[PDB]
Write a protein that binds this ligand. Structure first.
Ligand SMILES: NCCNC(=O)NC[C@H]1O[C@@H](n2c(C#CCN(CC(=O)O)C[C@H]3O[C@@H](n4cnc5c(N)ncnc54)[C@H](O)[C@@H]3O)nc3c(N)ncnc32)[C@H](O)[C@@H]1O
Ligand SMILES: NCCNC(=O)NC[C@H]1O[C@@H](n2c(C#CCN(CC(=O)O)C[C@H]3O[C@@H](n4cnc5c(N)ncnc54)[C@H](O)[C@@H]3O)nc3c(N)ncnc32)[C@H](O)[C@@H]1O
Ligand SMILES: NCCNC(=O)NC[C@H]1O[C@@H](n2c(C#CCN(CC(=O)O)C[C@H]3O[C@@H](n4cnc5c(N)ncnc54)[C@H](O)[C@@H]3O)nc3c(N)ncnc32)[C@H](O)[C@@H]1O
Ligand SMILES: NCCNC(=O)NC[C@H]1O[C@@H](n2c(C#CCN(CC(=O)O)C[C@H]3O[C@@H](n4cnc5c(N)ncnc54)[C@H](O)[C@@H]3O)nc3c(N)ncnc32)[C@H](O)[C@@H]1O
Lengths: 264, 264, 264, 264
């Protein structure tokens, strides 16, 4: 099938990529980075996230595979030593597809109420553009709390082991179609009150952040951080789109968590 | 329809119960506490939990309603001042049913591998029977961690605002069929390691706790705490059974959370 | 004695200031904002912090008093309704002085190893200037951990109820000469490890943060945030300097905490 | 000098003890377990804590040394391989003494207001004797909060790396004469409020726990857990007594923390 390979760009990843291209040349595999059906990422989770964003308009046509060339790689299923076995397995079509949920972020602006939308595989975060962060949190049009603090993080299931975890969030199995909102350093006193706890939302719930004073925010989507000025609303919901992985053997999520956080 | 009313048993709840029985006597409503179709709890969440356990063998035939006579009542939809409106609405059949997920706990023993099963509406917790608590946590037959600490808590979605919240768990919307495992004071050092984070499991995942040394445990299921001796395994999974509520007006979960924790 | 009054600058604080100046004119009190012996802050804790920094070179010659014109004011001992009683008490010399500890921050640079020093009443925080934050934490020349995450916060005792509290720090009575280091969203996995827990340091311990890759940092000292480029070291220690408060009646720290966080 | 050696009682610790007794027999060292001046503990921190409690009436006459025969031993300064070097160093008097603070717990009862006092090296904890735990927390006679939850923990500085750490407490250098109060699973909602944060108290502050309903409590002091009935008050303060360690080389507290929690 049509495939492409992205590389972190260090010597080890570049050479592994060239050797995999050579191995694929022995099968009916066409290198095509415009319309790949398989996208292989060689590097770390940063490389994988960049691969996802490179192809986020063709997610229903692509299955992703990650090779980790460091000690990490939550989205990675393969070690570099196994690349030749992976070339063979992929060239024979011997794989199942597994899908994880994604997060949709919509940013609405002032004069004209125009919108930008973003898809996240790990999370989308919001902070102030300098100065105090204060937003009203509105859940399905219900005013839920006024948040004062450093920022907020909305995670996908597979993102729950990333920034979300560092913020005290729950780790959620990716078969659950949900998003999880965590706080960054909320202020809580007799006058200012937030829920504190992480919140887990199902599909079709909408969480809107509404400015109270300042309308400028730094919004991240996975690695990408962007200053948005004149914001009227930031809206979070579980995307209808999913990312698909090519799976060749069992590697359960909870074993992946064990291997990344308990010991390997 | 057939109904019954449980009361906390203080003067206020007992009198409200008698006045509601009087009002129901003006409709085609039969008091029947053997096979009720509607169970009304007057008191607090403790009273509601006791009502649930009284009828846990007929959950598919019953819709529950809670009236709170104090300042609390997460499972309560009604204030005592509204009891006459509730009598009327219920007597006319003007309600929809909403279902929340439940937690199944199985305790397996020694000589004979016999089993006890329990259903929980809030949570099931495990602690040692005195002396150190150490269990292996096995997820779908994958050895995930060896837990050392005070205990573990497995929560339903609606239980996530209860003990789970105090332990740092996420609050989960009850449309999500899941259970959430939280730690109580885990020990973490260079030799002993746990995940720390709360874990959220979908339906059909099984979490087994397996003793390492001591086989005696104090196991709670909602308010009920029982010493179990000679335990071989404690198994948690999302139940196939659900609790059904009679709903007469919108009172969204997130508004309920707001009212209980942010302000009312 | 020589005094001055700073105001938040809204109508309520400005008018209270003018009325207090009028009342002081009935005693042997000279308004002097170059060498005051008493500095009165009318506003919130932000106003008080600004007053502290305005006079941080004459801290051994000044006693501070705060009036809070909102609902807040941890450093405030007086409500606006009591300003006339305060004018009288102050004009008669009827007060004791209480001292709180301060935090010294030293920032060392590249070409020339030049230094900037800062005093903090609440805390000093460090974050990256964009991009990843990674520092080595060195305690009394002992390499203690490599911190990866959003940032670090070093608090004074009286600052422990501020940013430190939101980050999970302990609240420390200000008779303890100490500083407290808290983490902001540390990453912890099989490869990256931090202590997690807040750390409390006595006087004479030195905590040095040493860059690992990027040498540019955003450093805050109380409200003031400054981009520092080409940083070689950030050094924290309990200052030899103290802030002095004029106290006219008992208002214990723990009662102040109760009133600010439990109820008033 | 007069010395004694306690052993964990496994083969490795018992044999090391016998070999150390043999080595001491080559110096002017008298084995005396009634009035030792040096107490050597061979085992783990549990063994060390038991040694401390065995001699808690002669703490001003004793210096303690711990050898750890497992992977642990926060109070241990020596590995078994170094026991012969320790015999020699101790027999020559080549050591300095370092002191850590201790916690005094006083339990007052009903009919007669009689008192029991306890000293703790790690911590003293309070839980209910079954059923709900509710106490008023009174600090220097100031009603500070009504605590509802699983229990409370009051730690010494050196105990801050023990149960206190698992409960989210700060780690405090033992040169600070203080105690630290942490919560176990407090309930917090619109009706029930606690501070949440750990609290650090200086010497001479008194923290009293006062029953609200049930008067029976399970009180731990280091490893020892005791049911106390008819309790009127539990009082915590930093002890005037200190534990003394014999130190033969530098092993800073923060390096000890690094070695126990970061890596060794
Ligand atoms: N993005 C700004 C978000 N911060 C606030 O809304 N701060 C105000 C609230 O904090 C209370 N407070 C202060 C103060 C003060 C004045 N600050 C604003 C200004 O100077 O303009 C500067 C301090 O902010 C704290 N800050 C920063 N970010 C967070 C965060 N995420 N969480 C919690 N605090 C945070 C740091 O401590 C700064 O040193 N001091 C105390 C005190 N010692 N004890 C109790 N309350 C106090 C004060 O009565 C008010 O209710
Ligand atoms: N259900 C028992 C679960 N506790 C343990 O496994 N404790 C042993 C571990 O803790 C380390 N430790 C100690 C100690 C010690 C000896 N303890 C057992 C005995 O005496 O038989 C008593 C202490 O246990 C602590 N304990 C109780 N429950 C929890 C919990 N849930 N979480 C964390 N600790 C907990 C309390 O502190 C008691 O005062 N002292 C220190 C120290 N000062 N600094 C660092 N490590 C230390 C020690 O090197 C070992 O690795
Ligand atoms: N100031 C940067 C600090 N962040 C890191 O060092 N991130 C790398 C570490 O996280 C692991 N990881 C990732 C990822 C990834 C790639 N990131 C860098 C890049 O793209 O260049 C972007 C993600 O960073 C996370 N990030 C940001 N700030 C914090 C923070 N304070 N704490 C914890 N994470 C934080 C957010 O999630 C971003 O979406 N994804 C996962 C995953 N899903 N599950 C487990 N591990 C994972 C990965 O294997 C590596 O070990
Ligand atoms: N040592 C007892 C300490 N527990 C309480 O004071 N519980 C009552 C408070 O919790 C609220 N609540 C309930 C409930 C209920 C009835 N419980 C008493 C009885 O049945 O007699 C049993 C439940 O207690 C929870 N429990 C136990 N220990 C802790 C702890 N340390 N921290 C927090 N909760 C704790 C567990 O969940 C049990 O399943 N259910 C909910 C709910 N689903 N959502 C929100 N609030 C709720 C309720 O409105 C009230 O304000």
């Amino acid at each position: 099938m049509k495939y492409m390979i992205t590389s972190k760009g260090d010597e080890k990843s570049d050479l592994l990529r060239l050797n995999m291209i050579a191995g694929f040349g022995e099968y009916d595999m066409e290198y095509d980075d415009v319309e790949p059906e398989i996208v292989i990422s060689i590097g770390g989770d940063g490389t994988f996230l960049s691969a996802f964003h490179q192809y986020e308009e063709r997610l229903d046509e692509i299955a992703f595979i990650g090779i980790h060339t460091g000690h990490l790689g939550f989205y990675a299923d393969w070690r570099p030593a196994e690349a030749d076995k992976l070339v063979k397995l992929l060239a024979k079509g011997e794989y199942q597809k597994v899908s994880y949920p994604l997060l949709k972020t919509t940013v609405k602006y002032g004069i004209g109420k125009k919108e930008a939308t973003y898809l996240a595989l790990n999370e989308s975060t919001v902070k102030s553009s300098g100065g105090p962060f204060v937003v009203d949190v509105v859940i399905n049009d219900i005013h839920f709390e006024r948040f004062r603090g450093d920022g907020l993080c909305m995670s996908t299931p597979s993102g729950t082991t990333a920034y979300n975890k560092s913020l005290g969030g729950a780790l959620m199995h990716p078969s659950i179609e949900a998003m999880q909102l965590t706080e960054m350093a909320s202020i809580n006193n007799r006058v200012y009150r937030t829920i504190g706890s992480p919140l887990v939302f199902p599909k079709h719930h909408v969480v809107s952040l509404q400015p109270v004073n300042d309308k400028d925010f730094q919004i991240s989507v996975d690695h990408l951080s962007i200053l948005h000025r004149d914001v009227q609303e930031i809206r979070y919901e579980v995307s209808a789109k999913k990312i698909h992985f090519a799976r060749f053997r069992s590697f359960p999520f909870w074993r992946r968590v064990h291997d990344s956080f308990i010991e390997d």
